[PDB]
Amino acid sequence: GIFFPALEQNMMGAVLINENDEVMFFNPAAEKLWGYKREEVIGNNIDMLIPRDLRPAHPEYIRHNREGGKARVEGMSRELQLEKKDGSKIWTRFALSKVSAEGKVYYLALVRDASVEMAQKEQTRQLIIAVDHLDRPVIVLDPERHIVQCNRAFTEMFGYCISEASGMQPDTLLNTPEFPADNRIRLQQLLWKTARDQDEFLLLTRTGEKIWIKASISPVYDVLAHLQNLVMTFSDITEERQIRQLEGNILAAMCSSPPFHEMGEIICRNIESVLNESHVSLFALRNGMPIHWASSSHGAEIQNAQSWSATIRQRDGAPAGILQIKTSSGAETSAFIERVADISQHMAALALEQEKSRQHIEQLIQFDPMTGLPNRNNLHNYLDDLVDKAVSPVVYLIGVDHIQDVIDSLGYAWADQALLEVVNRFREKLKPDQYLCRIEGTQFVLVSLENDVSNITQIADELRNVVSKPIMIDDKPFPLTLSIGISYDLGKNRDYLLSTAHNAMDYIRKNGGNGWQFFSPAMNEMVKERLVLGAALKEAISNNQLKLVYQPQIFAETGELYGIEALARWHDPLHGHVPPSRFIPLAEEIGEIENIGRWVIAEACRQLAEWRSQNIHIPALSVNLSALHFRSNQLPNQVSDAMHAWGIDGHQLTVEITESMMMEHDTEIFKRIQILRDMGVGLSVDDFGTGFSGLSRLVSLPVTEIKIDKSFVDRCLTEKRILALLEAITSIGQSLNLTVVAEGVETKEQFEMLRKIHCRVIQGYFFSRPLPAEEIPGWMSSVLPLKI
Amino acid sequence: GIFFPALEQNMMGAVLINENDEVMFFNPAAEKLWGYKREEVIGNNIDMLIPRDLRPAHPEYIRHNREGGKARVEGMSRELQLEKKDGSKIWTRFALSKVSAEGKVYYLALVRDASVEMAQKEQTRQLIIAVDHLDRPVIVLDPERHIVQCNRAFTEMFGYCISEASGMQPDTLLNTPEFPADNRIRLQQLLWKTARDQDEFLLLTRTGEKIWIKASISPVYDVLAHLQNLVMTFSDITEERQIRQLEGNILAAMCSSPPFHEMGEIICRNIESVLNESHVSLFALRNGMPIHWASSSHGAEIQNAQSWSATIRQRDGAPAGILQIKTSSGAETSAFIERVADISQHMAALALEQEKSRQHIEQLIQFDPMTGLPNRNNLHNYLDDLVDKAVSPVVYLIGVDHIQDVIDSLGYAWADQALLEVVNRFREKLKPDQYLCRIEGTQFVLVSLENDVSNITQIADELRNVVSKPIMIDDKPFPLTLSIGISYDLGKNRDYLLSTAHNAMDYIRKNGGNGWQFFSPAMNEMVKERLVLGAALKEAISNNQLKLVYQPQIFAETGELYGIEALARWHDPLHGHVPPSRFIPLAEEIGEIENIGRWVIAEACRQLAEWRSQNIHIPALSVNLSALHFRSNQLPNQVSDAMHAWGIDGHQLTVEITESMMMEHDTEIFKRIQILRDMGVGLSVDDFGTGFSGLSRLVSLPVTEIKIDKSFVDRCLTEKRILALLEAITSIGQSLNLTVVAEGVETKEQFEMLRKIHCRVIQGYFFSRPLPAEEIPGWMSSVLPLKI
Ligand SMILES: Nc1nc2c(ncn2[C@@H]2O[C@@H]3COP(=O)(O)O[C@H]4[C@@H](O)[C@H](n5cnc6c(=O)[nH]c(N)nc65)O[C@@H]4COP(=O)(O)O[C@H]3[C@H]2O)c(=O)[nH]1
Ligand SMILES: Nc1nc2c(ncn2[C@@H]2O[C@@H]3COP(=O)(O)O[C@H]4[C@@H](O)[C@H](n5cnc6c(=O)[nH]c(N)nc65)O[C@@H]4COP(=O)(O)O[C@H]3[C@H]2O)c(=O)[nH]1
Ligand code: HEM
Ligand code: HEM
Ligand SMILES: [Mg+2]
Ligand SMILES: [Mg+2]
Ligand SMILES: [Mg+2]
Ligand SMILES: [Mg+2]
């Protein structure tokens, strides 16, 4: 056989043993491997070749193999040890084989050195223990994006294992939530990115827990620039997303520049948001002495409380503030709390330094950013000037209410806009003599010089009605209210006035706000008296318990009744007799003047119908109307109704207007007068108007009568210069056919002294006091004519 | 023989070839490996076994081995590729030998399965990677303390490769500095410690500079509980401190609210400071397209450019920007680049969010959180509404300069206080119709409705005059200046108006500020001409070159001269004849009214003496005076000087006053009139008054004449109603001894129609034109009496 020397010189050392477990064949390669020679090996039991430990065990191993047979079993190639000539031990690769010839059974084992193979195995083990040491999960993927390798950190974080995850897609392996933010497409795009990339996803463990993980994919190529593998690393980011949220919230709040206390509160609550069940405190340095900035706690005692005290450093490096974090027993890692404190101190240094600079400047600042109004120091100086000038002012303290709603709904950048809108509305209505300033927060101070209750209440009502309509910001309505406190006293300092106004405003706010009040209950009760009087007047108007008293007018020469003027009168069961000089202006303030006008016109016309039933001529009847009455485009409707419902057509009715009405210039009012004048009813002007040119226009807008006021008539006795007034007034009387009326005559000498100027008619107490309608007919039939 | 069946039963495939390269031995193991049949194999050439692609190359190796002698070496045993009958490719293990038999050349080959070999090698390859990708330096130590495995992170961090660090001690590798001494003791105790341990050390690198290292050592035992290997991990301290400082600095930068490009720049320089010799670029995605955001100041390039790219996202999957960071290879470490890039992305996201929020807010803000004034949006809305209403407004653009000195001296807060003071000064003067707004910076816009040139000049002068008093801040003066551009055009839009106003303001500011001008050259020319005329008027008044003219006043009945009136006329060589209706209002605006008053009174008395030198009776003289003249407390001084210097005692002189003079109510003015009247000089009132009652009050301020306006006379015959005015006005004439003067008669019919009303005197063209003074004596002796 030509194969004898071939297997003799083959690379693998070949050892052949016969039935007797003795070596019969042996070759030079095995000589080199073991150390002994052919003459030293041939004819000896395999026991000498076996290492010493297995010496007894090897024979029964061979015997068991012989007994079993197993249809000529040859074993499997593996790795084993040798004992050399000097006793050294080496790793070798064995392949055994069983031979059966001539009924007997022989064996041969082929051996190669395995130093490289065992070095590889040691490298494998050391590399595995290097992988499974740090808790940063890494996995490897083939070109087809199938996971092929894992580690203990990954299997512990996600529950899976290499056996249940080998050779399958990573998206299919990792179950994602049901479209929370469309993260499925993001995960596929990160898997399919061809360059180094990273992303953040939301995943659930094998059990299922809401965990966010940051994944990073990197490609690794081969020598010839082909894709070889993709490695994906993961890291849990749950502890860092919350810190990102904290820094975002603090940054957003600080960009709006909130006040110091509320900024501290925001920081504290945001720290608590990331530290579950903790307590946080903030202190500032005031000349080295710590003071309390803000805090937030539930008050519950924290047993075994870990306490940390972080120090805030300014730009130069000096300490400025102290932040105390107290946490439960082992709630969170110390590095977490250290990081939170560091980021918080970095973000709070700016707040502390801006607060310090703000205090330093505001010690002496006499103005105010954010609505540009004056401030407390300016108000103090103004009030001190007023006090030393000895002029007692009226102080209104105004608190704007419901601003916290917009603060919590939109933010400080919009609360400021609401304040600006309110201040602009106030500026749109402030009078020249009023002083407006801002003291603190949502509080403002108005200084006025009106020492009169009727004007003070009007100013307060106007101020409260300023905010009647909602404020539209960012296309969102926001109804705000006002609480006003009013203080006015004589000889009082700034402190007394400010304290009283603050007390009034605080009482209104505590009771519910949306209103105004005085101090000084004695002055407060007058408002209740006025409201009850006005309610009684309105009730009387509605119930028609009002009256008309008629005073005649007489001629100078013939002593004949020129006409009468109807005057409104009122008597209440509770308030007695209310003079018309009192309750007519009261109706102007309320708004019942129109109701008065309709009643008087209807009653006066109806009374003329009653007098016409019997024999009474009554040439004319004068009825007073107010300026606010004539401002409406409804007068001819009711007046025409009066005439044609009782046959009192306008040649008998007469209407007199106030002097101030001609002072005003309204085209619509004048046209209504001209329409009314053309109907037949006359027009009369009291107080002789204002000027000849105006009365010349009153000649253009035709009238019939001119009335000389009582004050002018009374002064005619002494002031001899005003005689030409009546002479000129009467001159226009016959110049263009006007009837002049003398009012308030009281003595005979007055009647004779106005006779020479030729006053057309005379109306006064020298002839008759006003009389109730039930004896108007008696007066006509009794004294007519009179002494002339 | 007995070895051929043994060779057949060898479980490894065995083949043997000769010079002819035929296969003579193909055992069942080889059958199971390849798949070919024994008959198909025996006698064939190697070509039915050689791989197809290596077929062109194999005969070259055949020739090399068959010709070149390699000392009859067996060869090499290694892994190789086999293709199955179907075509699949597997890897097997080959051992080849060269045997010489019968003087010939024979080649022998043994082949295994090697499936597990493939698995082991591929897993080693897959596992060395993801050791090379762990972010921290981990090294595995054998029990006898020799480094066996070092990862890529450690390799690039310290600079000691695997070849240099294989089988040698960690202290000898990372030799620490001799100073201090305790380092060696500490590191030996750490290295030979058997428990998990951590510490800090001062290890040294191949190239130089010190690195402070946190070192951790952990053990790894075996099944039999003996130290099998140990693991050591390293971390750096300077790097983590730098990351913390970077995050803090960028957060502090954001909290101060800088602009977008400034924010990008500060981020860029922070990354530059934390990472040496790098270039950083930022792009922001607008409408899906990137735009440059910030870049390195060093615009050049550095060799060995390694680039890292990050995608800035914003709370969603939508990309928001791109970051590129480039650094030279070998300068720093991959983990440091990872960390800096990640933190930069997470901070730039906040920067982008803040920019977006600020832009959204500013798009809708309607007021100013500073000075409280309206802002550019409100101004735009106002101008748009006015243009839609089709009313052309006058736009003043005001720039306040000399404000940098306040910033340099005191600071930003005091600059804001000065700006507030200026705005308050504007508010204390703006009229109800005008509209004030702040656009930006030290610039404001005023909108007015009056389009008169004189009114605009008055408004501009008033605006410029308010800054004359220096701003008192902290008891320190601070002068400022105003540059005002006036734009006014018909039918133009707000863009054109604002552009023209800004052009004018910039022109003034560049030329030096402290002034105002129109945008229109024609308007500038008009202003220049008016100023030239005013200067000419002042020069003429100073150079006594004015002249007076006298218009006779005649008696209605006797045709005898009642008196004459002096009127001032001005003649200029350049401007010709300027009517008094043109240059008298100009004197009021300038301030020459007083000078005109003295000249007229002094000249009239001097002229009165000249007429009295010869025989002229001249019963009276009427001299016009202005209200502003009478408001000065000096009138009796010069007037009394006039009488006693020419013997012209007030029984002749007469002063006529404007109607508006009696409209005003000043006690000092009224007293001065009474003092003046008591001297003997008469008083005349033109255009009557607001009311005849005022004339009755004026009775206490004795008057002698009343003048009827020309407009009333010119409309007398057309409007028969105004006849009563003259009838009443004359009636007052004999009521209290007054003379009525009719001014402006032109025809005989007008004169006779005023005769029935018995007007006392007549002054008009029907009798005589205003006569120059040289022929007054001739007119007296030639025409009088006119005999009607
Ligand atoms: N000492 C004195 N007084 C005399 C003399 N002759 C008349 N009087 C008084 O002069 C007033 C005339 O009313 P008036 O001047 O229009 O001024 C009226 C008018 O302005 C207002 N008034 C009265 N009735 C009405 C009404 O129905 N409507 C309106 N709108 N105002 C009314 O009330 C004012 C006061 O009315 P009365 O209290 O009735 O006071 C009456 C009357 O009593 C006299 O010789 N001596
Ligand atoms: N067409 C016409 N005009 C007639 C007639 N009768 C008089 N006049 C004009 O009436 C004016 C009289 O001056 P005035 O009414 O006080 O109104 C004067 C006065 O307000 C002002 N003025 C003139 N001289 C002086 C002066 O020395 N001082 C002041 N302060 N104002 C003066 O100039 C105004 C008018 O300028 P004059 O040219 O003086 O206009 C003169 C005169 O020309 C007539 O029948 N027909
Ligand atoms: C340094 C030399 C040797 C070592 C270290 C060694 C070791 C071992 C050991 C530990 C076993 C136990 C079972 C196993 O591991 O599969 C075994 C099995 C066996 N050995 Fe050895 N052996 C050596 C030499 C030989 C030789 C030259 C033969 C020649 C026939 C032989 C015959 C056997 C047989 C027949 C089995 C039975 C395997 C079975 O039944 O599965 N041993 N060997
Ligand atoms: C799948 C089958 C085979 C493969 C992949 C293969 C591959 C190679 C390669 C790459 C070489 C270059 C030298 C080296 O790598 O050591 C080589 C050389 C050689 N091959 Fe093969 N061969 C194959 C089949 C065979 C067979 C069946 C024989 C039978 C004798 C053979 C005999 C030789 C010899 C003698 C050399 C010379 C080695 C030297 O001179 O370094 N080859 N073969
Ligand atoms: Mg009345
Ligand atoms: Mg009256
Ligand atoms: Mg005049
Ligand atoms: Mg005149």
Curated annotation (Swiss-Prot), chains A, B:
Offer one Pfam family short name for this entry. Answer: PAS_9
Q: What induces it?
A: Expressed in the late exponential growth phase and at higher levels in the stationary phase. A member of the dosCP operon. Expression is RpoS dependent and is higher at 28 degrees Celsius than at 37 degrees Celsius.
Biological process (GO) annotations held by this record are:
regulation of single-species biofilm formation; response to oxygen levels
Q: List the disulfide bonds.
A: none
Identify the residues that the record assigns to the PAC domain, covering every copy.
Answer: 197-249
Q: Which GO terms describe its molecular function?
A: cyclic-guanylate-specific phosphodiesterase activity; heme binding; magnesium ion binding; oxygen sensor activity; protein homodimerization activity
Keyword Hydrolase in the entry? The reply is yes
Top class in the EC scheme: hydrolase
Q: Enumerate the residues binding heme.
A: H58, M76
Cofactor(s) required, per the database record: heme; Mg(2+)
Instruction: State the SUPFAM superfamilies in the record.
Output: EAL domain-like (SSF141868), Nucleotide cyclase (SSF55073), PYP-like sensor domain (PAS domain) (SSF55785)
Quote the annotated effect of L96F. Answer: Significantly reduces heme-binding affinity; increases auto-oxidation
Q: What is known of its domains?
A: The EAL domain (residues 532 to 799) is a cyclic dinucleotide di-GMP (c-di-GMP) PDE hydrolyzing c-di-GMP to 5'pGpG; it has no activity on cAMP.
Subunit and partners: Homodimer; has been previously suggested to be a homotetramer based on size exclusion chromatography. Forms a complex with DosC.
User: What is the protein's name according to its record?
Assistant: Oxygen sensor protein DosP
Q: Which gene encodes it?
A: dosP
